[PDB]
Design a protein around this ligand. Structure first.
Ligand SMILES: [K+]
Ligand SMILES: [K+]
Ligand SMILES: [Mg+2]
Ligand SMILES: [Mg+2]
Lengths: 369, 369
């Protein structure tokens, strides 16, 4: 009665994730000057290029060359030996900016999902949490000089064996771990593989989940000197399952980064997480999936759905009534409840938007019923 | 004991979908000359621009100006009055091409899901099937001159009320429909709304699913003259839930368009659909979710998982054994079974990759057990 489940994450220097962080660096820059900025900033990265495209309504005057280049510096691409350099890369701006509310209409149509699971303290699947932490660990050891051969582009994948308990899920052991990470010309493969096991995996994954049968795919393709935008074109919103629940729960298709609160792709997904987490932390269920949907120009959600996997004594209809009584999921109210005009978005753009840093949507609401 | 569920689709002229079709037009062009072409083509669209970026290993010499512009012509953007024109738009190429197997390694790490449901004949959720068909209907009426005021950019959203039957799902009625579609300067709103109800919705949605309480959001934002890449920047792989199951089942994060068979994002997702559909059409279950995962450089999947929603008399472990005995999910075998070197991909890039046209992955395998 066991099953395998797999989730992945990627590091800050992965080209898709570079674009997410830049898109959010742009959004933060606008919001610092104009809290009411409307932003739909897409970023594209390739060998020697960052291109920005999209539509903005804002009173801000933003230095795109300075914002983009500082974001690439933070990530760690600061020399041509690493395949990309903030000092000398091309930055092209194709943004179209115009000068310029409880019941504001949704900025678009779409559907969004929230999810929570009691298998971890942060109410997230173990598979995705470990995957994220492996990439975070790599960045730490790169930045503090423990493994100076490390470069910013990385990918991890974690397969966990579960058992199920009346619709809830219980992690037993890690079955397989993959790690691929960009590196300098000097470091040999055996040194890298040894370090990824001892200094990364064993520092991150609780020892009770590792055993002698755990499968390790470390630098499985061999060498990986060419990385970042040089090796692989990147686009904003191409890591949406990394950003959310790692294959668990569900997704409505919408990207997060480069978008203001009126874009319910972001705001309503954050709120649905908040609802899902509030239901689990309030003891109403162990595992829960929440769907919402919107029409452009209309404030109230078109639909709200709760799925509890059989982990509640209450019916799904009862949980829906509790949600309706405790949450107002119009964009103009979510913005107040979750403080979404604050320029906090660049910090969400790597290592997942959920299960860390106690952002407002991770602080559960106390429920009246 | 009922619940709402919502799914969306978009038309061919939606900017994200323009990019998917162009990316696949590029892939098809390479495969026509070189069946073994390796392609990772990303497309970006904005006011007056199409940009191609990515990595190619191929012997083909492809006329990118001709391929891109013909794809935009097919879509219907052929005049500046429509906001975009294949004859006069900018085409920028940043592709990096190099000159150049049963047990070929996966081209990347990742996870992929397949899904099938017996609620429709095509084994797809009704919500997403109707959403797609509404957009297809709009394109038909535009192209045959019934509604000459229609332009190529459109979006639809369908909310259906379901009941559940031992883990299977049964559609009762359509609860809400949204349609937003780009139009000329002359047509008035009442004429558009009347036509969208009578000539689009009533032609597409079976009358047994429509009643007097069905909610209609037709041109809900008002007017919508500015559309396509002018109104909204587009990128390849930003409609991945539209491309697959509309919120149902699950997704691994990977985009389809612009990718050859070695990119398991595409090939293994197509195969997992094939597995899921084969299990339902073979009578082993009514509804089923299949996960697979891979490591870059490794041929065999790292994990395979089956979830039947309680709709089988067999255990999930038993269904997994049947899958293993009947399917080889290495990329180098899927390529033969599903004929993935054939240049058929541009036709997959709108209206979903599943539930139509009897592509090889929609023809179920007869299962030995
Ligand atoms: K790519
Ligand atoms: K956009
Ligand atoms: Mg990518
Ligand atoms: Mg988009």
């Amino acid at each position: 009665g066991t099953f395998l489940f797999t989730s992945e994450s990627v590091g800050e220097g992965h080209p898709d994730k570079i674009c997410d962080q830049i898109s959010d660096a742009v959004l933060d820059a606008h919001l610092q000057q104009d809290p009411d900025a409307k932003v739909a900033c897409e970023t594209v990265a390739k060998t020697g290029m960052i291109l920005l495209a999209g539509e903005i309504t804002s009173r801000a005057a933003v230095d795109y060359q300075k914002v983009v280049r500082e974001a690439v510096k933070h990530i760690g691409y600061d020399d041509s030996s690493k395949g990309f350099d903030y000092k000398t890369c091309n930055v092209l701006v194709a943004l179209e900016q115009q000068s310029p509310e409880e019941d504001i209409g949704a900025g678009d149509q779409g559907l969004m999902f929230g999810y929570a699971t009691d298998e971890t303290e942060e109410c997230m699947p173990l598979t995705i949490v470990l995957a994220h932490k492996l990439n975070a660990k790599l960045a730490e050891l790169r930045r503090n000089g423990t493994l100076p051969w490390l470069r910013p582009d990385s990918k991890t994948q974690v397969t966990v064996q579960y058992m199920q308990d009346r619709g809830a899920v219980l992690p037993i052991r890690v079955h397989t771990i993959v790690i691929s990470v960009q590196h300098d010309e000097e470091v040999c493969l055996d040194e890298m593989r040894d370090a990824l096991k001892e200094k990364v995996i064993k520092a991150v994954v609780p020892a009770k989940y590792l055993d002698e049968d755990t499968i390790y795919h470390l630098q499985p393709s061999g060498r990986f000197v060419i990385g970042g935008p040089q090796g692989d074109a990147g686009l904003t919103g191409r890591k949406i399952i990394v950003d959310t629940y790692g294959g668990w729960g569900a997704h409505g298709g919408g990207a997060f980064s480069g978008k203001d609160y009126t874009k319910v792709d972001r705001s309503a997904a954050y709120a649905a997480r908040w609802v899902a987490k509030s239901l689990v932390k309030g003891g109403l269920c162990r595992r829960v999936l929440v769907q919402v949907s919107y029409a452009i120009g209309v404030s109230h959600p078109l639909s709200i759905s709760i799925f509890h996997y059989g982990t509640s004594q209450k019916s799904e209809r009862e949980l829906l009534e509790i949600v309706k009584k405790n949450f107002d999921l119009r964009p103009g109210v979510i913005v107040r409840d979750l403080d979404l005009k604050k320029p906090i978005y660049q910090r969400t753009a790597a290592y997942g938007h959920f299960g860390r840093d106690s952002f407002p949507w991770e602080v559960p609401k106390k429920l009246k019923y």
